Structure 1
Amino acid sequence: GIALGMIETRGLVPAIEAADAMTKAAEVRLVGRQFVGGGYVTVLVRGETGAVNAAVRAGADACERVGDGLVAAHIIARVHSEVENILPKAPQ
């Protein structure tokens, strides 16, 4: 799929928990964890629109209560071709 879901957290433990929740909620691929700086970590998943929607909702619900908590949780079903140049393909 080409839908994009991202979750912003303050700290890495909530980010890992959120990514775990999205990956266990639906058939999405974790394509990157990004250390934004200042304590922000962003986990990005790709998949079908319904799968990404469910994964992002489950991740937000799970990681709302851990660590400094959720900062943002967004779903982009249709990603512009320009935005794909700033989106990671695989994590590291």
Structure 2
Amino acid sequence: AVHVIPRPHTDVEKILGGSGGSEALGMVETKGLTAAIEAADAMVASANVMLVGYEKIGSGLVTVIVRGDVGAVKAATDAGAAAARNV
């Protein structure tokens, strides 16, 4: 699952940490920490986005979160997901 949530409410974003009114959040759900880190690295390499965190939701699933302006987040989440395939 790759997802861009546009215009989230501050409370919604703050609880994930990074209290801001970000124009968008991008999420790449990965399997295992290797895919997670490679995804994150690919993400900050590809666009002007900030890493918000890795959410370990159990069962080896790590969902990587970035924040930033819309266009950057769209581009970053695609890069992050592609990088996850490649590990």
Both proteins in one fold, TM over 0.5: yes
Q: CA deviation at 1:44?
A: 0.2
Q: Which has the higher contact order (CA 8 A, sep 6+)?
A: 1
Among residues 24, 28, 33, which one is paired with 1:7 in the alignment? Answer: 28
> Structure 1: any 5+ residue segments left out of the alignment?
67-92
Length-normalised TM-score, structure 2: 0.72
Higher helix share: 2
- TM-score, length of structure 1 as denominator length: 0.68
Displacement of 1:2 in angstroms is: 2.3
Does residue 22 in structure 1 map to residue 43 in structure 2?
A: yes
Distance 1:60 1:21 in 2: 9
Residue of 54, 68, 71 corresponding to 1:50 = 71
Give the alignment's Cα RMSD to 1 decimal: 0.9
| Runs of 4+ displaced beyond 6 Å | none
Q: Percent identity?
A: 59
